[PDB]
Design a protein around this ligand. Structure first.
Ligand SMILES: O=C(O)[C@]1(F)CN(c2ncnc3[nH]c4cc(F)ccc4c23)CC12CCC2
Length: 167
């Protein structure tokens, strides 16, 4: 038993809710919240900009130190940093950005990072401003992640479409 509430169950291990991931994280304080990061951990907009804003920019300060020490992430890669006031940990995961021409096959590699964590609160990778089809992203998530994932979808219209088209 865990504290996630109001989710629709899609599969044995994947759940979905129309929710603002920032507000969901603030209430649940999950062990892991996933950020839709870029390789530079520049949290300007989308999910990343919203998560970072909710931390009063502490996520960005920590991220800049991480990059100064380690250099950029790989597309499809991840790093674990603090969850600040939102979660114990933040798993920063880089899905491919279609608006940068990155290979969509890397979306599966991105979701594989989730398997290193037993339970996660997450957005759909490569959705939103990353330009991928969220229905495809949901399919890859279901077919790749084996650990327990609670997907927060900000847009109600999109959430209803994801549920109604789910196979
Ligand atoms: O940034 C993108 O492209 C996204 F569409 C944004 N998404 C979100 N998902 C779940 N809760 C969210 N709260 C927010 C508050 C905001 F001000 C802005 C975006 C969100 C948001 C998923 C996405 C990241 C991969 C695709």
């Amino acid at each position: 038993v865990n504290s996630f509430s109001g989710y629709l169950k899609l599969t044995d291990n994947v759940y979905i809710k129309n929710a603002d991931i920032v507000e969901e994280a603030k209430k649940v304080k999950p062990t892991v919240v996933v950020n839709a990061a870029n390789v530079y951990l520049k949290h300007g907009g989308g999910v990343a900009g919203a998560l970072n804003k909710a931390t009063n920019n502490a996520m960005q300060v920590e991220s800049d130190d991480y990059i100064a020490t380690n250099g950029p992430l790989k597309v499809g890669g991840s790093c674990v940093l603090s969850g600040h006031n939102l979660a114990k940990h933040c798993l920063h995961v880089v899905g491919p950005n279609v608006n940068k021409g990155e290979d969509i096959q890397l979306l599966k590699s991105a979701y594989e990072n989730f398997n290193q964590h037993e339970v996660l609160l997450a957005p759909l990778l490569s959705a939103g401003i990353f330009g991928a089809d969220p229905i495809h992203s949901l399919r890859v998530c279901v077919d790749t992640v084996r650990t327990n994932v609670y997907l927060a979808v900000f847009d109600k219209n999109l959430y209803d479409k994801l549920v109604s088209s789910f196979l």
